[PDB]
Design a protein around this ligand. Structure first.
Ligand code: NI
Length: 341
């Protein structure tokens, strides 16, 4: 049944609660972003109103075939009224179209649901700065101090430099980038840009990327694999067998693959710097795991919460074990005591 951390008290609202059937006493279903654990349950036979960003709206219509009359897109950074309640959607710095939602309850309570986010100091100057938040429903994916990772900018620098070096040394090398969901598009677009290539991909992936309002996208992507020297493939296929097989497919156009697996965290991060990362190699194939995260590090999360000073924190990730729950509640108390709220 629908867990308490997906219900918004004092409203007829739920967030990311599409796999429990008709939720008793829900008049509007919000969707924070188009990732499968969050949309799980939506389909073309959904007949309740869905509130979301413009981008998430394009994906619901075009990928899931939800009928248009049920899709209610809202602009960002704008005060809107839904079933008599003021709401605002804010950029979550997650994947394209991902939002946080501010709810202004009739009784005066203000609630922030972060959805999935990567906390950034730029958020300290949105409509969030203007009033007090009583309850915070928080993306706690990496809520433990061992989770450090570099900035998205440093990781992209590493990938750009690595790819450019390899292809300039061997013009017959192919670069492959794994994907299994929207998000992390900068990886493959930044690499293609330094190489003067378009990114080649399947028709299903091309379709997905056309929903995202990325400027000049027609100039950056294609379904013609042969004309492109950056290929996207399903993440599952980023391994020596899958890559050997793909190399066969290119018809002796290429004699070397350099591949990138964007991962979240990987325990190599406790000891090693981004400058220091090395590939796994077999023959003429090299695979790089790069720590490109679209979730808050532990320090980013802590800084955001200490700035916001909520009265109550409700975790939405890692809530399934008592040991996880108790670990997280300990960090929340430290944060609050260190900062004085
Ligand atoms: Ni997500």
């Amino acid at each position: 049944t629908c867990p308490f951390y997906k219900k918004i008290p004092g409203t007829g609202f739920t967030v990311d609660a599409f796999q429990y059937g008709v939720v008793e006493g829900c008049t509007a279903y919000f969707l924070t972003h188009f990732h499968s654990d969050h949309y799980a349950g939506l389909s073309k036979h959904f007949t309740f109103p869905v509130y979301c960003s413009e981008i998430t709206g394009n994906l619901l219509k075009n990928k899931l075939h939800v009928q248009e009359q049920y899709i209610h897109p809202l602009p960002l950074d704008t005060e809107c009224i839904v079933n008599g309640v003021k709401v605002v959607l804010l950029d979550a710095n997650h994947c394209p179209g991902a939002v946080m939602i501010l709810f202004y309850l009739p009784n005066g309570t203000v609630i922030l649901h972060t959805g999935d986010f990567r906390a950034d100091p730029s958020m300290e100057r949105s409509l969030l700065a203007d009033q007090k938040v009583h309850m915070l429903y928080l993306d706690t994916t990496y809520c433990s101090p061992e989770y450090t990772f570099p900035s998205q900018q440093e990781v992209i620098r590493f990938a750009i430099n690595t790819a450019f070096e390899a292809v300039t040394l061997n013009p017959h090398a192919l670069v492959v980038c794994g994907t299994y969901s929207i998000g992390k598009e900068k990886v493959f677009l930044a690499i293609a840009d330094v190489l003067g290539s378009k990114v080649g991909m399947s028709q299903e992936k091309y379709k997905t990327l056309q929903c995202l309002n990325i400027p000049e996208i027609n100039s950056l992507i294609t379904t013609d694999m042969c004309s492109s020297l950056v290929h996207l493939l399903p993440m599952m296929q980023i391994n020596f067998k899958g890559l050997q097989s793909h190399l066969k497919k290119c018809g002796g156009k290429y004699n070397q693959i350099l591949a990138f697996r964007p991962t979240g965290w990987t325990h190599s991060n406790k000891f090693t710097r981004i400058a220091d990362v090395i590939p796994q190699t077999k023959g003429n194939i090299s695979i790089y795991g790069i720590p490109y995260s679209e979730h808050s590090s532990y320090l980013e999360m802590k800084r955001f919460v200490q700035w916001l000073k909520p009265q109550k924190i409700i975790p939405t990730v890692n809530v399934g074990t008592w040991k996880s729950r108790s670990t997280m509640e300990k960090y929340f108390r430290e944060w609050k005591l260190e900062a004085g709220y």
